[PDB]
Nucleic acid binder design. Structure first.
Ligand SMILES: [Zn+2]
Ligand SMILES: [Zn+2]
Ligand SMILES: [Zn+2]
Ligand SMILES: [Zn+2]
Lengths: 75, 84
DNA sequence: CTGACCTTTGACCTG
DNA sequence: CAGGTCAAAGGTCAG
């Protein structure tokens, strides 16, 4: 399962087993240098059914579980 | 592209594609989403078989929603609020 | 309330 | 295993 949200994985992406959503989200976040904010306590639950409720916490978990922004290639 | 893309199955207005399972316009997509999110209940002042087309789609909310469902719209395709 | 207009997601695909 | 695409989810706010 996806290390970030436990949805079905599509293989390794940026260093971890990940679903297509967390893969795409991470890529976009890095490619565009997105900066997010948490409207709650920066401790939001991130699973298959809640991952889109907080981009800040989703990204934060992407890094925590070991996604590597250095595997996002330059333009 | 062509000025013809798709057509709303509920009222006949222009459509860019499917929403909640069915070719629909911005109006009918929005009306369905709001109905589901707020669990609104409507009543028909006539015989529950009002005609739904572009010019009268707002006249009877009951019959507009019932046609959304009858043409195939899926309540469960409406998601939770995001903020993201 | 409606509906025209804007942004993000993720399934699917290639290289 | 990367990055791009685009249908269909999300969203706002004038009228
Ligand atoms: Zn995931
Ligand atoms: Zn959060
Ligand atoms: Zn319509
Ligand atoms: Zn009616």
């Amino acid at each position: 399962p996806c290390f970030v949200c436990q949805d079905k994985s599509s293989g390794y992406h940026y260093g971890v087993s990940a679903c297509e959503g967390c893969k795409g989200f991470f890529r976009r976040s890095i490619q565009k240098n997105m900066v997010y904010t948490c409207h709650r306590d920066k401790n939001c639950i991130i699973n298959k059914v809640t991952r889109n409720r907080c981009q800040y916490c989703r990204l934060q978990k992407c890094f925590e579980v070991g996604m590597s922004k250095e595997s996002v290639r330059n333009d | 592209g062509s000025f013809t893309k798709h057509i709303c199955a509920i009222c006949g207005d222009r459509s860019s594609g499917k929403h909640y399972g069915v070719y629909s316009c911005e109006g009918c997509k929005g009306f369905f989403k709001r109905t589901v999110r707020k669990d609104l209940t409507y009543t028909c002042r006539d015989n529950k078989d009002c005609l739904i087309d572009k010019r009268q789609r707002n006249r009877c909310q009951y019959c507009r929603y019932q046609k959304c469902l009858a043409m195939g719209m899926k309540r469960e395709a409406v998601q939770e609020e995001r903020q993201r």
